[PDB]
Structure formats: C-alpha cells, structure tokens
Symmetry: C5
Subunit: 284 residues, 5 copies
C-alpha cells in the first residue's frame, strides 16, 4: 500500500488558552532561586541579542549611508537581527518579564495562583531580568570596546547609532512612552501566544520572528531591551543622564507594558474563555 | 519513517470552510463582539507598525531617487502578521467571515436573521476596535505629527500621501480594487484551512497578504484604521472624502468579492460533496 | 519519540501524477469548465498584483541607473502565489494539465476523445477567466492607464515595455521560451505531488515559479492576460503581435513541453512500475 | 483531552551513512538504457536552471549598475536562482554525476557493486549528463536568441555576463582549477547527504538552497554547469575557444570533482562507519 | 470523516537538558581515533564555509561600492553565507570543540564522564579541528589563488577584504578579545541547544541560521573560524604577523570561548536542572 495518514500541528484557538493558563499556573510552583536563575539567564540573552543587533545597525549606519538612507537601513537591520532572543529564552526554559504578565495574570484570573505568589513571582522575575541585562551590558558589551567613542566621524558609525537611538528613546513624553510600551507588550504577548498553538519548529521560529521584527521596526518600547540599551548608553558616555533613564523612559515603559499584558489582553480573553475552561476543569 | 501527509485540498477544505462558517452562529452576542473588537485592535497594531516601517524608507533623499518604491514594499512585508494574530487568537475579521458565513447560508446551515446579525456585529465590532486603536495608541504617542521640517517629517508624509492616494479613485475603481483585495483575503483564509502546517500557515498567509498590500487594493478594516488616523493627525482629507468616497465603495467591493465572486463558484463546484459528507456521518 | 517522513518521491510521485491526471476524466463537463474559469481569474489576479509591484519599482530615476533589474525581480517574487491558489482551491490550468493528462493517456487510463474534451475545456475556460479578470478588475480599476506624465507613468511604461519585448520574437524563439516555461511549471506540479507538506508546497513552487518568471519564458495564460490588458489599456501593439506573433507559438511550445519534453521519457522510465502498481491493486482487491 | 504526540523530522547521525550506501547500491541495478534516460533528464534540468540563472544575472548586470556596483549583484542573483535544479533532479528520480561519486563509490567501498558495473554506471551517467546538457544549450538556449551579441552598450548585459564569466573561468591554472573543483563537489556531496537525512520539505528545500547558493556565489567550478555554460558560450561566439573550454578548464574540474567525491570525503566517512554498517547488516541474518 | 492526528514536532525544556547531557556523555567512547577523524572533518567544513563566505563578502567590497556602504554589505553577506557550516557538521556527526565545551562539560558535571576522559576528548577536538582548518586553508584556498594580492585596486577586493578583516581581528587588547569570544561561544552553544531540542528540519536549518548569522555580523570571535582566517591571511602575506596571529588572538579567543562554554552556560544550566535529571534517571 502507499496511502499516508493525515496530521495536523495547529491545534489551537480555544486550547492554546488552556495551555497558556496552565503554563502560567505552575510557573509559580518553582523555587525562589530557580526563578532567580531563569530570570538572570533571560536577561543575559536579551543583552546578547541587543549587542548583536546594535553592532549590525551601526554597521549599516555608515557616514555616507545616512546622507541618503537616513536610518532606513539601520533600523531594518536591527529589526532583522534582534528577533532571535525569543528562541534562546524559550528553549532554555527561561522566563522573561514581559510574557509573565499575560501568562501569570491568566493563571490568576482563573484563581489558580494566589495573588501573593503573583507578587513574589513577578517581582523576582523583573528584578532578575534587570540584573542579568545590566550584568551583560557591562561584562560583554562595555569591556569589549565595541560601542565606544572614536572621535573621528569615519569610524564613529557605531557610537552615533547607540547615541541617537538612546536619546530618541529618552525624549518622548509620559503619555507617548506609555502608549509605545503598551504596543510593544501587546506584540510580545501575541508572540508568546504563538508558541503554545503552533507546536511546529518553523511555526515557532518564523512566527515569533515576524512578531518581534514588527515590534522592533515599529518604534515601540520594551522594558528589558530599554534597560540594556540605556544602561550601556550610560556606560559609554552618551549625552543622556540617570534621570532620563529610570524616570523619563523606564518608569513609563514598565507601566505601559504591564497595562498591555494584564489589562489589554487579559480581560477580553478571560471574558471569551473561562466558560470553555470550565469543562476542562471538570475533566478527571 | 511512517509516511505522513499534512495537506488536503478541494473537497475537504470546502468541508472545513463550511463548518467553520456555520460554527459562529452559535456564539453569544457578547463574546462575538468581544472577538470582533480584538480583531480590530490587532489589525490596528500591525497597520500602525507597518506604516511607520514604510515611512522609515520614505526619507527625503531616498524619495528623490527611488520615488516611493521601497516604502510600499516594506509596508507589504511588515503588515502580514495581522493574519497570524487573528487566526491564532480565535477572533474574526469581517472580511474572512464574509466567505465563511455566506457559504454556510448557501448550504442551509445558518438562518437568514442569524446571518445578518453575525455579520453586522462583526462589522461594527471591527470598526470599534480599529478606530479605538487609532486613537489610544497611535494618536497619543504622536508618531505621526506634522513635524514641520523636510528632513524629519517622513512618518507624517508617508501616511498623508497614502491616505490621499486612497480617496481620489472614482467609484468603480475603488469597488474593483476592493474586489481584488477580498479575493486575496478569502483565498488566504482558505489556505489556512487547507494546509494544517505552521510553516505553511505563516508563509501562505504572508505571501497572500503581501500580494494584497503591494497591489494597491483596498481593505475595509485597514482603510478604516488608516483613514481615521489620517483624519486625527490632520492631513489633507475631508471626512466626506474618507467615509463616502472611500469606505462605502470598498465595503461594497469586499462583500461582493467574498459572497458572489468566490462563493457561488465554490458552492456550485462542491455542492454535493457536502451532501454526501453529511449523509454517511 | 517517533520518526516520520513527508517526501515520498520517485515511483510514488509518478503513480500520484498519473492517477491525479486520470481522475479529471470523470469530472463532468460543467465541473471542469467552472474550475477552469476560476483558475484563470486566479492567475489574472496574481499577475495584476505582480505588474503593479514591478511598475512600482520602475520609477523615472531608477531605470536611469539599474535598468530593469528590480522590476523583473519583484515581478517574479510577487507572482508565485497563483500556484498556491490553484492547488488549494482545486482548479486547473492548461499548463498543469498537459503533463498530467498526457501521462494519464499514455497508460491508457484515459480515452483519447475524453482527453481532447478535457484539454479543450480547460483552455477555453482559462482564456475566459483571464480576459474576464483583465477587463473587470484591471481596466475598470484604471490602474495601468497612461497618465501622460513622466515621473508618475511607471505602471503604463512597464506594461508597454514588457508587451513590446514579448511580441518581438521570431517563431522559433517564442517556441523555445515557451517550452522552457512549461518545463518549469510541470516540474513544480511534480513537486507538489511528491512533497505532501506545507512548507515544501509553498517554497518549492515559489522557487520554481520565480525561476520561470525571472528567466523570461512564456506562459500561455499569463500571456493571454498580459497581452489582453495591454490591448485594453492601449499600449503600442496590435491584435496580431499578441494572438498570432506571440500566442500560437507559446501555446504549441507549452503543449509539446508538457507532452514530449518531459512525459515521454518519464513514461518510458516508470511504465513497468505503474504496471506493477496496477497489478498489485488488482491483486489485493 | 489534548496530548499531541512528539515526532522527529530527522533520524540523522550514524544512519544517513546507511541510507547513502543503500542508495548508491540500489542505483546500479536499473538498466543500461534507463540510467541513460535519467541522466539525460538530469542534464536537461541543470541546463534549464543554469539558463534561468544566467538570464537573471545578466539582467542585474546592467551598464551603470556595473559602474556603480562592480558586478556583485549579478553573482548574488545567479546564486539565488540556481538552486532549484537539485529539487528538479531529486523529485524526478534523475541522477547527476557529481551526486554519484559520493554515493556509488561509497557503495562500492563496502563491496556491494562489482568493479566493472561501477565503471559502467559512472561512464553512462557522465555521457548522458553531457548529451542532455548540450542538447538543452543548443535547442532552447541558442534558438532563443537570448544571449545573442547586440553590438550596443546598454543592451549587451546578457552577452557581457556570459562572456566575462566564461573568460574568467578559462584563465585559471591546473592547480587552481582542481582546487575550485574539489570545493564545489564537497559542497554538492554534502547537499546530497542533507537530502538523504532531513525530510520534511524545509530540510529538502532550504538546506540545499543554502548549500548550492554558497557553491554558486563562491566561484567553485562545477562539472555539469561548466559543460553547459562553456558550450553555450562557444555557440554564441564569445571570446572563448574550444581548447580553453574542453581541455584547459573542463578536464581539471572533472577530475577535481571526482577527487572530492571519492577521496576527500567518502573515505573518512567509510572509515568512521565501517562498524556501524556491519552491525546494521547483522540484522537480517536471523531477523527474518 | 476528517480526523487528523495532533502532532507536536517540538518538545523542549527539561528534555533539552536531558538530550544534551546524554549526548555529551556518549561522545567519550569514540575509540580515541574516531574523534580525531571527525574533528578534522569539522575543521575542513569550517574552512569550506569560511572560504565561501570570504569570497562572497569580498565581492561586495568593491572599490566604488565601498566608498558609500563602507563595509555594510560585505559583513552582511559574509554572515548570510557562513551559517551552513553548522548544518554540514551536524548532519555527518563531526566533533567541534567550541560547541563541545558546553555539552562535554555538562556531562562532566553530572558524573557521566570522568576527568581524564574529558581532558583527552577535548584536546583531541582541539587538535583535530585545527588540523582540518589549516589543511583546508592551504590546499584548496591558498592554491586556487583566489586571495592573492592582485595589485590593481579595481580587482584586488578579494584580498583587501581578507586583509582588512584580519587587520581588525588582532588589535583589540586582551580583555576585548576575551569579551567578544565569550559572546560568540555563548551564541554557538545556544545554537547547539536549538538544533538539539527542536526536532524539525525547518527549525534545524533556520534556528541555527539566525544564531550563527547574528554571531557573525556582530564582530564576535570564534576560535576555529579565527584559526582558518588568520592562517590563510598569513599564507597570502597580508599585513599581520604570526605572533599577532597566535599570541594576540588565538590565545584570547580560545580562553574566552572556554569560559563562555563551561562557566557561563554550563554552571547555570547545571544549577537549574540538577533535580529534573535525577528524578528522570531513576
Ligand atoms: C516564552 O518566553 C518569553 C517569554 C516572554 C518574552 C520572550 C519570551 O522574549 C522577549 O524578550 C521578546 F520576545 F521580546 C524577545 F524577542 F525580545 F526575546 C519578550 C518576552 O516577554
Ligand atoms: C482566520 O480568520 C480571518 C478571518 C478573516 C481575515 C483574517 C482571518 O485575517 C485578515 O485579518 C488578514 F490577516 F488577512 C488581514 F491582513 F487582511 F487583516 C483578513 C481577514 O479578513
Ligand atoms: C497544481 O495545479 C496546477 C496546475 C497548473 C498550474 C499550476 C498548478 O500552477 C500555475 O498556476 C502556476 F503557479 F505555475 C502559474 F504561475 F502559472 F500560475 C500554472 C499551472 O499551470
Ligand atoms: C539525484 O539527486 C542528485 C543527485 C546529484 C545532484 C543533484 C541531485 O542535484 C545537483 O544537481 C545540485 F542541485 F546539487 C547542483 F546544484 F549541484 F546541480 C548536484 C547533483 O549532482
Ligand atoms: C552540532 O555540532 C556542532 C557543534 C558545535 C558547533 C557547530 C556544530 O557548528 C559551528 O561550527 C558553527 F556552525 F556554529 C560555526 F559556524 F561557528 F562553526 C560551531 C559549533 O560550535
């Protein structure tokens, strides 16, 4: 005989909802040092991919390439070489903050996690991610002399990129930074939701690539990425300060990101579902 | 290596389409609208991102020697993720629904009043979602302000020029472009049901949506979002130019393209395969 | 875990090809006609999109430097979705049919009268679909018309130039390009018959169609659509240079490319194996 | 309930060797005038894809595009639109020559095919590939009037691509030619290994695309490809000759491709997997 | 009636660690001489892909093209055509030291390999990869005259690129080469993790594609690839020195890669999954 058997991998929509709920749920039943270590590893990963993307962008940000291109090439290159951090953060079993919002709030609305454990888990995750991102920004990004200031305009195509992008991220307004943050985190949550319903290698890679590339080229603001880039911009002595980092950009970035995760995608999805989840709860 | 087959076409894709179509008549009027507004918010997300991405390539000195060639390409290349967000989420856009629920109606699965109410709730909710994302995320962040300069105002000018180009078509031209758009879109919604493969999923929908974007076709929800955010950011267009010159012809076109240009053909070809499938089952 | 596989190629591909050709014999006359017109308008839609993208990359100050490099490249990159459309919905083009139904006739799985019937029906339908879409969505949509300016006439200049370059071949040249085109097309059909997977389908045919587009070969229905819209929009050609000087050669080239270039050899190769398969299906039940 | 079953798309490692030796073993049973038809088809496919690649490159080889860029974009486009030939040959069951050296000499190494039969399969495959390649280069690529010289500066971008690429091929040395040849085959043979280990379509298309795109952009000399391009360049009356095409370049790349197929890689693989193939063959003694 | 099978091509997390440590353990029973053959094969494979990438990147290093882009397209094409070395190595079963560091050390940690076996396995891997890389850098690369100093500036790019690249693979100070090395190895070990835990051919190709491309375009430092690059740059008589080649890059690149493998991706991941593995092996 020669007849094959059918097969399918996109088993989702109303089941990826249950996968999200449980994945967020038993993320709480780990050890404090376990969450700590996963968070620090994810921060290191974000630092790595952001250094890589910055070097590529500053490569395409040459002196005579701006005079015509005007940062079209540089941003496209950054948005092309950044969307790989997701793979290293997922396949190593790590956990980042931006996706913890969606997952863990889903698991809390269903009353599977206690809200104190919610506090513990997500403060640990955010603190660890900051710790890892800044540790990488200093150990492998700054002692590597990559983004330093070479006072000649010919070679400075690396300093001016990490200077311009930073001082552009700073000078938004509170409202603007918040809206860009909510946009970024909605894209991030959607990329996280992809994985639970594709269950396909190419599905994984290409779906999250498209999502994160859209976020990156879009101009939205990610808290972990912002943490890394602004810390390193401070370390290589660009023209921003500490105030414009953890107040004028960072405070808004976290507020809007959490709003997008817990409120924008939280209550609509919880209203659609929670009555499809009931039957799955009834099962033995 | 046992031989596996991750594709079926023709008859079976039609069965899946008609079943997904007659499904949505059983949802409550609340979660249906909830789903519709989420689809709108996602198309707004992706349209905003792709718009700023295309405006990036619309530089003052690039436009001189490329003449908007690269901007439209990056728009088309950045948009097509919206398909993935909606299908994965469990939501629905009115364009996709057209083909689905009209095929069910033809089959005798959805009643008439249920058909009217599903499709109207879908259109209304999608408008709500698009026009609310247009304000709360894109107007407040100020990404499209008329930065009164020549070498910093590309994100405004790209949106301004595309929104102007989208209004000056005469009636029949807007109708025809919308017809083509919905043909593309319903073909993509068909691909998704035909091949149940993540790689095939993302790439089939990406190619379909890219060909739909770069071709100058008119999409009703994307038009809603873009034209609203071009009214907010104070470009050259009159409310009348956006809502009666553009939106009405493109809605005419999208519905017609989904319901009769590709619904009666596909229902006359496979009229009785569905009969037999329901017989022995 | 458990190991799997998708691509079952070689003999299995030939058996699938000959039986997928066989099947078309019994679809009623109305049934093939409908599917024909549908595939025609699909190829028309995708070609319209392709030409619009190409013209977009045909600006005034662009050709003054790069000539036509980006134009043809983006054209060929935008076209390949028509195959996915036709294979997903289940319609047929003449280009796909040549190989399939000749290979089906060779095994005497078909009749000759029904072979003539299915071929004529498919060609008539594809022509009707291509010209209907060329009139109703390309010329009423006034997208290719000649806005007599220089800096915004890309979408008429591109179409004018490709039509002019296609009508200007000697008989043997158009025939040669046509056989090249249909060779690529039926190899793509063989690809989807042997892959049985999603990404395989998509990218396999993408590369095949892109290669036959960028090369400048001659597809008969693509040429129907493009030359008929060029006649509508009134570029600088005539009815001759489309129907007689370009379309008869490409029709004959495509037919012989499907019928004899590949289809006479592969029959000779796997005749014994399909005989074995038929005898085995008769051995079991 | 939901519980998707885990699969594995690649059974690689110590097994692709078994599959490759089995493939090369079974290939040598077909018939005399059957291998002929398969080889002629493979040559036709190589010619088709090389013609498309040449047209694409010459397109991107415009006059002012040369003066700005320096003939870098045309090479990239050629390398991008070449790789389809592998899928053509694979799905149609046809076999090129370069593929055989890595497969059928490995088969013979284990003492599966006789010696005589090995030599005859080699010669039949190469003769058929040659005849098919030059048949396509005459009947579809010369009668097309595509690469015809124009005697004009802004339309000659196809003739110029063909001319200069051939003229850069011919000015090699024997040592240089054989080194470029061995590099190319090493690429081709690893692509064959790819195909016979990774299933699932994307492994069938993308791996081989990347491999032979590297082979194309890298400047490595391919035997069948060189056959096609130099024969058609001669047909079009470029600056190339008959002895700079056949003896000076064609023979060194032929010998180098064979060397890289049967000695560079194929001997170490055999040294590694002797025992694994022995313990594999240890099964059907009493398993059946 | 329609009823496909719910497939799942990817099963990662704890399974990834399980597979990586069992593979790192299994690679230490290889007869003391299969390891060397596989390592030399890996060396020649890296040489293959790096030669091809050098030619590709040099093609975009034109004189005139260089005046505008200034190396943006060169490095991009180089990184775009390098990453096939990963696939070509894994599909045959070779032995790469820089990737062996994580897998091989982890297995050491969990008491699956021993001290002397770990020692000798990785010294074999070192020597074999080096032999393969230098052999390929001489026989096929130096002999095919593709990199000679054709002293006309219009055609010399295939030399200049190589030259220029080597020129700025040396002049870092110590700690700078160490940091770039740490980053590169971290990348390649995560690529190994990817290719191990995502069991699909599609991901097989594309995960490692993105990983190695991002490693390459980022100016990081491999040790096998740097061995090939600097050897062949010596053979052509560019503006470098064997002392700068060895005591200024190789010394720094190998140390940094080893630190990135066995201490920054092997001690964390061993503190994470130390119990999930035990509860699995009994
Ligand atoms: C499933 O694992 C997660 C969970 C959450 C995130 C993640 C992975 O990856 C991000 O970092 C990213 F997608 F934005 C990246 F691309 F930058 F990596 C953001 C994020 O919240
Ligand atoms: C799976 O359900 C549907 C139903 C309908 C649509 C859809 C999904 O995806 C779209 O939204 C889209 F992604 F293709 C867009 F780009 F056009 F927005 C179009 C559309 O109408
Ligand atoms: C699988 O069934 C077929 C049957 C026939 C054809 C086909 C598929 O694919 C085409 O549509 C195409 F994609 F190659 C196009 F570009 F020419 F349109 C042409 C064609 O003959
Ligand atoms: C039957 O399977 C084979 C056998 C051998 C070859 C093949 C497939 O495909 C190639 O033609 C190629 F595509 F890799 C090319 F690019 F080198 F042409 C090389 C080659 O000899
Ligand atoms: C699966 O087996 C391995 C093991 C290790 C590596 C590898 C494969 O692939 C590399 O060779 C590479 F591709 F990343 C290179 F390009 F950097 F060389 C490096 C590396 O560590």
């Amino acid at each position: 005989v020669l007849d094959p058997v059918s097969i399918k991998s996109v088993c989702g929509g109303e089941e990826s909802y249950i996968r999200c709920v449980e994945y967020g749920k038993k993320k709480a039943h780990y050890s404090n040092l376990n969450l700590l270590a996963k968070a620090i590893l994810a921060g290191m990963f974000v630092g790595l991919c952001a250094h890589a993307s910055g070097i590529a962008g500053g490569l395409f940000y040459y002196h005579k390439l701006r005079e015509i291109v005007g940062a079209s090439m540089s941003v496209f290159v950054y948005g092309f070489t950044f969307p790989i951090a997701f793979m290293c953060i997922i396949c190593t079993g790590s956990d980042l903050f931006t996706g913890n919002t969606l997952a863990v709030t889903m698991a809390l609305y269903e009353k599977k996690v206690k809200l104190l454990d919610y506090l513990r888990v997500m403060t640990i995750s955010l603190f660890g991610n900051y710790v890892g991102a800044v540790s990488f920004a200093f150990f492998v990004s700054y002692l590597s002399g990559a983004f330093t200031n070479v006072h000649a305009v010919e070679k400075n195509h690396f300093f001016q990129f990490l200077n311009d992008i930073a001082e552009k991220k700073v000078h938004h307004t509170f409202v603007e930074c918040v809206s860009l943050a909510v946009g970024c985190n909605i894209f991030v949550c959607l990329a996280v939701y992809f994985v639970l319903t594709l269950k396909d290698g190419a599905g994984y890679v290409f779906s999250v690539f498209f999502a994160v590339y859209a976020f990156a080229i879009a101009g939205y603001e990610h808290i972990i990425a912002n943490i890394y880039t602004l810390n390193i911009a401070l370390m290589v002595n660009t023209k921003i300060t500490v105030y414009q980092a953890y107040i004028k950009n960072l405070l808004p970035t976290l507020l809007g990101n959490y709003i997008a995760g817990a409120i924008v995608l939280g209550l609509p999805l919880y209203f659609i579902y929670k009555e499809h989840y009931y039957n799955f709860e009834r099962s033995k």
